[PDB]
Amino acid sequence: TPVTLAKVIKVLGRTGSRGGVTQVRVEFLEDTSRTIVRNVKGPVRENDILVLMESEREARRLR
Amino acid sequence: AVGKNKRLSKGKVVDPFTRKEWFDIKAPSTFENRNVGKTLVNKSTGLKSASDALKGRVVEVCLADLQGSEDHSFRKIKLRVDEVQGKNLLTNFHGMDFTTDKLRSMVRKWQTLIEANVTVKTSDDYVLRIFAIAFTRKQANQVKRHSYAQSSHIRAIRKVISEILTKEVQGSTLAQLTSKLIPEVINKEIENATKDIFPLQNIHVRKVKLLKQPKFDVGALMALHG
Amino acid sequence: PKKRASNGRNKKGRGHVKPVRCVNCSKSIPKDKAIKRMAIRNIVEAAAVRDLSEASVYPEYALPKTYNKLHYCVSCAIHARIVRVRSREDRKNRAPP
Amino acid sequence: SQVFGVARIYASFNDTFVHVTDLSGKETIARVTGGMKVKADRDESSPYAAMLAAQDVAAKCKEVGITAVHVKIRATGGTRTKTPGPGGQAALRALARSGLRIGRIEDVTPVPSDSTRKKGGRRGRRL
Amino acid sequence: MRAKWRKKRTRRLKRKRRKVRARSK
RNA sequence: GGUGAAAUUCUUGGAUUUAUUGAAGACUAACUACUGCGAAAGCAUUUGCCAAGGACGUUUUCAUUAAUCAAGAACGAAAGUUAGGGGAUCGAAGAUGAUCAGAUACCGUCGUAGUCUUAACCAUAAACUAUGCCGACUAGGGAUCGGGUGGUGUUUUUUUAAUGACCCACUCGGCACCUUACGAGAAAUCAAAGUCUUUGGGUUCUGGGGGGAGUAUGGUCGCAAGGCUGAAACUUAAAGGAAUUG
RNA sequence: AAUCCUGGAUGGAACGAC
RNA sequence: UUCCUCGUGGCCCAAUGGUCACGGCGUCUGGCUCGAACCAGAAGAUUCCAGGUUCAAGUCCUGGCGGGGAAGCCA
RNA sequence: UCCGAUAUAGCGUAACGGCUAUCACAUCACGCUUUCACCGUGGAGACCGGGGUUCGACUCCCCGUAUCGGAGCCA
What we know:
Chain B: Residues 1-13 are annotated as: Disordered. Chain B: One of its GO terms (molecular function) is structural constituent of ribosome. Chain B: Its main location: cytoplasm. The structure is cut from a larger assembly and holds chains A (63 residues), B (226 residues), C (97 residues), D (127 residues) and E (25 residues). Chain B is α+β, with helices and mostly antiparallel strands. Chain B has seven helices and eight strands; from the N terminus they run E-E-H-E-H-E-E-H-E-E-H-H-H-E-H. In chain B, helix 4 (153-169) packs antiparallel against helix 6. Chain B starts with 19 loop residues before the first strand and ends with a helix. Chain C is 13% helix and 12% strand. Chain C is built from two helices and six strands, in the order ββββαββα. A two-stranded antiparallel ribbon of chain C has the order 1-2. In chain C, strands 3-6 form a two-stranded antiparallel ribbon. In chain C, strands 4-5 form a two-stranded antiparallel ribbon. The structure holds four RNA strands.
């Protein structure tokens, strides 16, 4: 049951019909130079850290 | 989806890859490379003689893989199997083809397309349907934007191309013709014969296909593979 | 009243234009009234290309593309957040953006 | 050094097929569909499901002996959409990340020369 | 009602009147 | 598999999928456009054959033969009809699965007729540019299609030539287009919808408030469906058009 | 002094006027 | 007249001899929203009548009332 | 009478002698939806009956009942 840590580098905007969700692009700490886009639930800032229970996925960007 | 299936069977384990063996595929001599890859079949049982199921196998592969250069990048080639001798089975030519990306990229609007096709036979009693394609080009010094033709130029072009291909085939057997195709000299013949009519960029030919093969003739095939 | 001069389209001199079918609704619409776009797109995306280049033999291969001419009907076109609508005066702007 | 196969990803709406073969196409390996890894009938087409399928067939090819693969990407074609589905590219990327090697991608979506007839009616799929 | 369907209705009616008058004539 | 989601359905008898062939019939993508031809409907693969036709050029010929049209005649989308052929997709009807308060409607899966062709009928349509045809004149600008003329213009050949393809200039005829309003119009809008109260170039057809009614009847055409012609009684003060603000 | 590059969307039900 | 069958909440319809009885609609109350629709909830029963068997009959049996169907032929 | 198969939660269905047993429907809640639906997570629920074999029977042996389908038939 492994995980993947990633650092935030760039917030994009809010998403979801109710806007309680945020898109972000992160940078993997180990195996760096990898930048994936994800959704997030609660408050967030740049340079925070998140825990992908699965690293191999990404949401439909809105842009 | 997983548990949706109401019934597996109308009325009411063994691995298959241990049952199989690998075979090395050899191309003819009109190619800088020969070892195209591998293939799979089951063992030659007493009632199958796996060679028979393996005989008519066709493989599609890149001319760039066969010649090293990425200039022959699109140019897919179809090779039929014709003979087996101990895990290094041979092939012969069966047809050429372009890639759809290349074709669509060549195709643009505000230029006129031209297509020809012939149904000619060889000296070695092969029968080929060859397809040719061309596209107008906008001369330099040209301001007007579309560069179309007048539909008689086109017919003249088509006549020229047809007689050219009939000439260049009759005299070429099959591999003679392969060696004519590969260096794209036919394209230069076309442009030299048609420049006096109309510019004509992008004179790559098109896919070519076989219709009728002659008798097998083991010797002609083995003449290629040393 | 008359809302447009070409009346919807680019037919002046024909009578008949041999229609096509929309890709979304399969509706039969003339070729000229229709709304042709061309989705010339790299095959995979701008993202995974790096992984592909990393894992690909035949370096610098091409990253080829996908080409297709898409005819939409008016209804589906508007519904898809395309040509959406314009005011009475900028209707006449014939050019793209 | 390498040994090649062929992927033949058919990524429609409503599903995604990944089934990998030898260069001749006749002999096949590891045919799997997106619906075989999830229970919706809805997510059959989803990128996650296609990704899982790609992981599975990557494992199977690796344990067989295959290392490289060519890609033939395909949509429904014919009279239908003629554009790929969502679950093609994700699975492509997925088998790339799994450990395999790639060569000579190509699309083979069957395009006609003005085929028979497209369904729905001249008024369309009203919805 | 849409004139197309008004016309259709009238046509069917005329069929009926034609045959009921043919019963005699 | 198909869906917004599902289900009907097919599925260890191997579905779906992959590959190789084979048959059938329809279609003629991408090129394909503010482009072409045609009297209009309408017409898109190649080659060949048949005859036709517009434009241009012409120091060719005839010599007013011309323009528009009642009656009258040809062609006439699709659907439809009759009789054979073929009948792959799609698919009125119909059968079904769902949705729904109900849904014989939209969605989905099957599916006859028809969709294709030959012979013969029908003879309409938002058959629309909703703008009759012929002729003259009146503002600018550019692009384009076909032809034609010119230019030591460019390029290609055999440096060279002739051609051909481009460029510049000009012109005849076309599909059209951008700006403006001197004008017109109820206005939208219009290079014709202008040259009409300063009312008249020629000519054919049509309309006279809305409804009833394109109905009834009688004729005539039609295998039939139906078409063309076509009222009144009665009823009503408003229907209606273009634009303004909400 | 090194240095290859890109844009992209699906969608259920919702009668009436005292 | 004979034979066969049926009788259940306001209507339709069901039930293993084993709780004063399943459902659906209707009705009533509340809510959303003015009403329908919709969501939550309740009430309503001497299972046609009179007898008996059974510890226990809506049902098992006989009789009575009513409805419905079939037969009602040979001359 | 013979051969074979079947009996499993309120319905239906799957199962190996190292388990009072799985599944979708049904219902009890928890959720999520403006609401309706849709959709999701936890629970409570069953091996036809009877003997026998077995460190152990849903499962194997025997018998019996019921059902199916095909063969059959001297009181």
